[PDB]
Paper text:
Initiation of macroautophagy/autophagy is mediated by the ULK1 (unc-51 like autophagy activating kinase 1) protein kinase complex and the autophagy-specific class III phosphatidylinositol 3-kinase complex I (PtdIns3K-C1). Here, we show that PIK3C3, BECN1 and ATG14 contain functional LIR motifs and interact with the Atg8-family proteins with a preference for GABARAP and GABARAPL1. Two hydrophobic pockets, HP1 and HP2, in the Ubl domain of Atg8 ensure binding of the side chains of the φ and η residues of the core LIR.
ATG14 is the autophagy specific component of PtdIns3K-C1 and is responsible for targeting the complex to sites of autophagy initiation. We obtained high-resolution crystal structures of the LIR peptide complexes for PIK3C3 and BECN1 with GABARAP and for ATG14 with GABARAPL1, respectively. Co-crystals of GABARAPL1 with WT LIR peptides diffracted to 1.14 Å for BECN1, and 1.4 Å for ATG14. PIK3C3, BECN1 and ATG14 WT LIR motifs bound to GABARAPL1 in and extended conformation with the two core hydrophobic residues in position 0 and +3 deeply bound to the hydrophobic pockets HP1 and HP2. The ATG14 LIR had the strongest interaction with Kds of 2.85 μM and 1.9 μM for binding to GABARAP and GABARAPL1, respectively, followed by BECN1 (Kds of 10.5 μM and 7.95 μM) with PIK3C3 as the weakest binder with Kds of 49.5 μM and 65 μM. The higher affinity observed for the ATG14 LIR motif compared to BECN1 and PIK3C3 is most likely due to the presence of a tryptophan in position 0.
Author numbering:
A (entry chain A): 2 to 117
B (entry chain C): 1434 to 1443
Write the structure that this text describes.
């Protein structure tokens, strides 16, 4: 359901992920988009090059700042429809959840359950 | 297009 996948077929996405992993080998590519039904602002950009040793919390902080929420606006992130463990790094999430186009897909929402 | 995220520092 991500817009990046509605916009580009698999082979295009794979060739982009492959090319990015070869050009920036110490980064992992991550597509960040709103979850279905989410009532949250859009990000300016959806394609991120993430340092593999970022912790999940550090990633949350960086993405949250780009959404420009008020502090009182809650924010949740999902990988494969589940909130990731906080104790992970983004390289771990990528190792365990990247798709066959070489991208990790992260959804975000105001709600704590994906697709609510 | 892409956004390169920073790393934290000691």
């Amino acid at each position: 359901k991500f817009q990046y996948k509605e916009d580009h077929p698999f082979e295009y996405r794979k060739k982009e992920g492959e090319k990015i992993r070869k050009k920036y080998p110490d980064r992992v590519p991550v597509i960040v988009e709103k979850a279905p039904k989410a009532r949250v602002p859009d990000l300016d950009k959806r394609k991120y090059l993430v340092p593999s040793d970022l912790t999940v919390g550090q990633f949350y902080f960086l993405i949250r700042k780009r959404i420009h929420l008020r502090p009182e606006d809650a924010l949740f992130f999902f990988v494969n429809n589940t909130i990731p463990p906080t104790s992970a790094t983004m390289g771990q999430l990528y190792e365990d959840n990247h798709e066959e186009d070489y991208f990790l897909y992260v959804a975000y929402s105001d709600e704590s359950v994906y697709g609510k | 297009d892409w956004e390169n995220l920073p790393s934290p520092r000691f």
